[PDB]
Amino acid sequence: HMALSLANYLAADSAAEALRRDVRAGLTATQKSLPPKWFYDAVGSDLFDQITRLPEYYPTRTEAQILRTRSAEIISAAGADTLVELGSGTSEKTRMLLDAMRDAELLRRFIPFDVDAGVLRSAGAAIGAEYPGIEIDAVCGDFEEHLGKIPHVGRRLVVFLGSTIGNLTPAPRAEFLSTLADTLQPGDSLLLGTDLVKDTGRLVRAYDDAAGVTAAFNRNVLAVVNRELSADFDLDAFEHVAKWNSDEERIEMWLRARTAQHVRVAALDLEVDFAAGEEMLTEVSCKFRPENVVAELAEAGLRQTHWWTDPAGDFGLSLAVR
Ligand SMILES: C[N+](C)(C)[C@@H](Cc1cnc[nH]1)C(=O)O
Ligand SMILES: [Mg+2]
Numbered sequence: 622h623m624a625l626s627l628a629n630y631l632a633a634d635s636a637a638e639a640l641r642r643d644v645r646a647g648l649t650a651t652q653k654s655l656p657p658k659w660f661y662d663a664v665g666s667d668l669f670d671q672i673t674r675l676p677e678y679y680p681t682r683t684e685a686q687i688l689r690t691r692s693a694e695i696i697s698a699a700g701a702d703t704l705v706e707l708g709s710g711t712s713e714k715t716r717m718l719l720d721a722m723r724d725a726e727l728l729r730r731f732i733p734f735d736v737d738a739g740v741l742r743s744a745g746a747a748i749g750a751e752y753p754g755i756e757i758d759a760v761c762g763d764f765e766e767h768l769g770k771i772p773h774v775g776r777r778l779v780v781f782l783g784s785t786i787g788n789l790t791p792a793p794r795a796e797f798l799s800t801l802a803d804t805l806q807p808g809d810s811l812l813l814g815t816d817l818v819k820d821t822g823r824l825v826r827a828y829d830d831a832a833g834v835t836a837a838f839n840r841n842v843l844a845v846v847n848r849e850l851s852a853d854f855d856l857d858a859f860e861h862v863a864k865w866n867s868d869e870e871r872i873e874m875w876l877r878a879r880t881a882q883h884v885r886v887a888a889l890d891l892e893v894d895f896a897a898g899e900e901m902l903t904e905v906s907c908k909f910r911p912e913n914v915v916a917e918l919a920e921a922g923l924r925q926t927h928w929w930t931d932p933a934g935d936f937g938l939s940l941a942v943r
Contacts, residue, residue: 622749629738630770636791637849640888644846645867648886648893652890653901655842657874660904661736662845668838677830679823680816683936688714691929691938692721696778698927698940699810700734703730703775707764707785709737710744714782718812719752730756730775736763767798767802777809783814784936786905791881794907798921802810805943811923813939815909817930821865824908828863830873839903851887858882862900872905914939 640659647654661669673681686694696718704718710733722728731748733741741759748755762770764781771779779801789797801811828835840863844852859882862875878895885892895901913926914937923941930937 622746624749625736625742625745625757625759626743627745627759627761631736631738631763640845644850644886645889645891648884650889653893653895653899655901655903657842657847658736658903660842662837662841665838665841665845666850668834668841671832671834672838672864673831675834677823678835679827679935682715684782684814684938685714685717685782687931687936687938688717692717693724695812695927695929695938696721696725696727697778698897699778700727700808701778701810702727702778703732703860704728705734705771705777705779705902706730707725707734707779707781708783709733709735709740709757711740712750715748716751718778718780721749723752728755729753730758732758732760732771732777733764734760734764735766736761736769750897753754754897758806765793765800768800773804773806775938777805778812779805779809780812781810782814782938783906784814784906786813787816787909788905790869790905790907795917795920798923802922803941804941807943809943810917811918811939812940813914813916813918813941815937815939817935817937818870818904818908818910819867821867824872825863825865828874829861833861833943835863835874839876842903843876846886850889854877855882855886866905869905870908870910872904872906872908873902874906875900875902877901886893901916909937909939 637861643656666715738761745757751797791837840856846852847854858879859876862877864873875899882895918941925939925941
């Protein structure tokens with residue numbers, strides 16, 4: 622099944638330059654950091670897939686169970702014939718929504734939007750084979766820059782699942798939602814997944830699993846830098862640390878140097894020192910309160926028409942309209 626349309630707004634040389642800029646800025650900052658987008662090379666994407674099946678990492682299965690039991694209601698409320706996914710279309714959650722759109726005799730079109738064109742091609746072929754006659758228009762782009770490149774055809778249900786929105790701190794998060802709302806037409810809908818404030822032990826353990834998989838995922842960002850920028854990070858020298866930040870109500874992932882480290886990043890003509898015990902921030906994952914989700918949507922210009930949550934209150938899905 623080779624039927625496909627694909628627009629690609631991302632260039633290899635542009636991505637390499639973004640990594641250079643990000644690593645230089647993050648490793649020379651007074652408090653070191655690295656952006657989590659760089660976790661998702663081939664290795665890191667596979668580790669994240671594994672994370673979604675860990676006993677401690679409740680978000681994926683919780684969101685999936687909400688969609689499993691409520692997809693027909695979501696689809697009926699949206700009335701859309703086109704599913705736009707800020708994501709690659711590889712998950713069972715995608716099929717739950719497409720199945721419900723098919724069951725309702727609404728489904729015409731799938732628009733996956735993500736950063737890896739090869740994965741979009743694979744997902745497109747799989748979706749095409751499962752939903753014969755569906756139009757697939759894939760977009761390779763950055764969801765903080767190319768949202769205007771998503772086609773406007775049809776009545777669109779735009780979905781952003783998994784609480785990936787929690788990787789944006791409040792100012793960029795507000796800008797993202799405001800921009801997204803300005804690409805929607807009357808009649809379009811946003812389905813947004815948000816992980817919720819809950820027991821703090823359960824939160825920390827979800828990012829510090831017993832098997833060490835999250836720790837490997839986190840340290841792999843050092844392997845990305847090592848490979849792409851000719852650096853010599855010693856991954857064994859960095860401890861994985863997950864923290865609950867109660868002031869910002871967010872999970873944080875950090876890497877902590879066990880002993881002083883001297884790291885050359887040869888491609889940047891840069892050497893960088895870590896003191897013993899020095900920590901570097903690699904990810905934030907903001908957790909939400911239901912009343913604040915409504916307010917953030919409203920501030921972006923969207924009205925929350927529906928809210929779904931599991932019986933434990935662990936996770937929330939919002940449907941919002943212009
Ligand atoms: C895919 N998101 C960004 C939603 C995940 C990434 C992640 C999982 N374990 C550590 N980081 C999340 O924040 O829970
Ligand atoms: Mg040099």
